[PDB]
From Swiss-Prot, chain A:
Species of provenance: Mus musculus (Mouse)
Tissue: Expressed in bladder, colon, kidney and skin. Also expressed in bone marrow, liver, lung, spleen and erythrocytes (at protein level). Expressed in myoblasts (at protein level). Expressed in red blood cells. Expressed in cochlear inner and outer hair cells (IHCs and OHCs) and vestibular organ HCs.
Compartments where found: Endoplasmic reticulum membrane; Endoplasmic reticulum-Golgi intermediate compartment membrane; Cell membrane; Cell projection, Lamellipodium membrane
First-to-last residue of the parent protein present: 2356 to 2451 of 2547
Domain of life: Eukaryota
More about this protein: Piezo comes from the Greek 'piesi' meaning pressure.
Its biological purpose: Pore-forming subunit of the mechanosensitive non-specific cation Piezo channel required for rapidly adapting mechanically activated (MA) currents and has a key role in sensing touch and tactile pain. Piezo channels are homotrimeric three-blade propeller-shaped structures that utilize a cap-motion and plug-and-latch mechanism to gate their ion-conducting pathways. Generates currents characterized by a linear current-voltage relationship that are sensitive to ruthenium red and gadolinium. Conductance to monovalent alkali ions is highest for K(+), intermediate for Na(+) and lowest for Li(+).
Subunit field text: Homotrimer; the homotrimer forms a propeller-shaped Piezo channel with a cation-ion conducting pore. Heterotrimeric interaction may occur between PIEZO1 and PIEZO2. Interacts with PKD2. Interacts with STOMl3. Interacts with TMC1, TMC2, PCDG15 and CIB2; the interaction may be part of the MET complex. Interacts with MDFIC (via C-terminus); the interaction prolongs Piezo channel inactivation. Interacts with MDFI (via C-terminus); the interaction prolongs Piezo channel inactivation.
Name this protein carries in UniProt: Piezo-type mechanosensitive ion channel component 1
Cysteines joined through disulfide linkages: C74-C78
Disruption phenotype: Embryo lethality at midgestation with defects in vascular remodeling. Conditional knockout mice in inner ear hair cells show no auditory and vestibular defects.
Entry's family note: Belongs to the PIEZO (TC 1.A.75) family.
From Swiss-Prot, chain D:
Other information: Piezo comes from the Greek 'piesi' meaning pressure.
Organism taxonomic ancestry: Eukaryota, Metazoa, Chordata, Craniata, Vertebrata
Disruption phenotype: Embryo lethality at midgestation with defects in vascular remodeling. Conditional knockout mice in inner ear hair cells show no auditory and vestibular defects.
Family: Belongs to the PIEZO (TC 1.A.75) family.
Tissue expression as described in the entry: Expressed in bladder, colon, kidney and skin. Also expressed in bone marrow, liver, lung, spleen and erythrocytes (at protein level). Expressed in myoblasts (at protein level). Expressed in red blood cells. Expressed in cochlear inner and outer hair cells (IHCs and OHCs) and vestibular organ HCs.
Oligomer status and interactors: Homotrimer; the homotrimer forms a propeller-shaped Piezo channel with a cation-ion conducting pore. Heterotrimeric interaction may occur between PIEZO1 and PIEZO2. Interacts with PKD2. Interacts with STOMl3. Interacts with TMC1, TMC2, PCDG15 and CIB2; the interaction may be part of the MET complex. Interacts with MDFIC (via C-terminus); the interaction prolongs Piezo channel inactivation. Interacts with MDFI (via C-terminus); the interaction prolongs Piezo channel inactivation.
Functional description taken from the UniProt entry: Pore-forming subunit of the mechanosensitive non-specific cation Piezo channel required for rapidly adapting mechanically activated (MA) currents and has a key role in sensing touch and tactile pain. Piezo channels are homotrimeric three-blade propeller-shaped structures that utilize a cap-motion and plug-and-latch mechanism to gate their ion-conducting pathways. Generates currents characterized by a linear current-voltage relationship that are sensitive to ruthenium red and gadolinium. Conductance to monovalent alkali ions is highest for K(+), intermediate for Na(+) and lowest for Li(+).
Residues of the full protein shown: 2212 to 2307 of 2547
Compartment(s) of residence: Endoplasmic reticulum membrane; Endoplasmic reticulum-Golgi intermediate compartment membrane; Cell membrane; Cell projection, Lamellipodium membrane
The protein's name: Piezo-type mechanosensitive ion channel component 1
């Protein structure tokens, strides 16, 4: 429905986004197991937003689309996502 | 023992290909991610074997690189993104392709991104394929 | 392949262009290119 | 002495995140550069400490990674660029 065309409406992204992450000198950078014992349950969530833009299917192509993310539980910093990283 | 080593295969997690013309912008670029990267099962490995069975060099070269050591990327040819072109660049494209009797070449390139847990030293190994085209030829004409 | 897309030279700019590749000798998997790589 | 090492922190200058669906194209991608990368002050480190204070594992894990060792990126949720989509890809998106 978001990618189709309609008035503003959110999606179902059920807290896939872990808040606290760790960046070792190791090849990759893992999240934190202790801060997220529940894993996805302790992860945070967001919603995709597609803001259309008139210019000048074909009408859908006319609008300019861009995915917009916003905290599932957001109050005043809706336009910003703080993500904790652990610089080892 | 300090010299014994297990032949642990390093399979690239990601692959990217790009198709660029001139020094202006990439025309096209894909990246097969997980599901378009099929590692060969043993059966595919024998299949590669009999297809090149008469040729001995092919057999030894396959016999070295185990089925886990050889994979195939199913790059989505048509599943592209919009190819933006600054109209100045477009116009100069067309004008040169039409009358500019110069030599313009592609910059077609492949990069392989390794697991980085499976090691692989440099994990962004890539090679470029630049081949000049022919002016006053139907190739440039059809491109234009 | 350059697939144009109506929106709304200038008409050429109107259409959206994107290069598309297809095997020269393609039968049924026209929308996919298998490329064999040797993971050493 | 050849074994003594100073725990010099390595703070990433840049960070990038991307949101991609299917094997077709990234839908979104952002990169907080300098000013959206806030290193924690000792007060912020303290704040992280009392918030998870009952939990012992969190306390030791924070006690290891000093405030300079932990930073937060303020990735701009809405400040993205145009998400171009080749219409073939779009149509197949929708149909599937």
């Amino acid at each position: 429905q978001l990618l189709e065309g309609r008035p503003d409406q959110s999606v179902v992204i059920p807290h896939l986004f872990p808040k606290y992450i760790r960046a070792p000198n190791g090849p990759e950078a893992n999240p934190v197991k202790q801060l997220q014992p529940d894993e996805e349950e302790d992860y945070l969530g967001v919603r995709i937003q597609l803001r259309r833009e008139q210019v000048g299917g074909t009408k859908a192509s006319d609008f300019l689309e861009w995915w917009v993310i916003e905290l599932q539980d957001c109050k005043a910093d809706c336009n910003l996502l703080p993500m904790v990283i652990f610089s080892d | 023992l300090i010299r014994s080593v297990v032949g642990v295969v390093n399979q690239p997690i990601d692959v990217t290909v790009t198709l660029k013309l001139g020094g202006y912008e990439p025309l096209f670029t894909m990246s097969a991610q997980q599901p378009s990267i099929v590692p060969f099962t043993p059966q595919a490995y024998e299949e590669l074997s009999q297809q090149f069975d008469p040729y001995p060099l092919a057999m030894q070269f396959i016999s070295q690189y185990s089925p886990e050591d050889i994979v195939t990327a199913q790059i989505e040819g048509s599943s592209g993104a919009l190819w933006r072109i600054s109209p100045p660049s477009r116009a100069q494209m067309k004008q040169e392709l039409y009358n500019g009797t110069a030599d313009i070449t592609l910059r077609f390139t492949w990069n392989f991104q390794r697991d980085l847990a499976k090691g692989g030293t440099v994990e962004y190994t890539n090679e470029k394929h630049t081949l000049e085209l022919a002016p006053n030829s139907t190739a440039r004409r059809q491109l234009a």
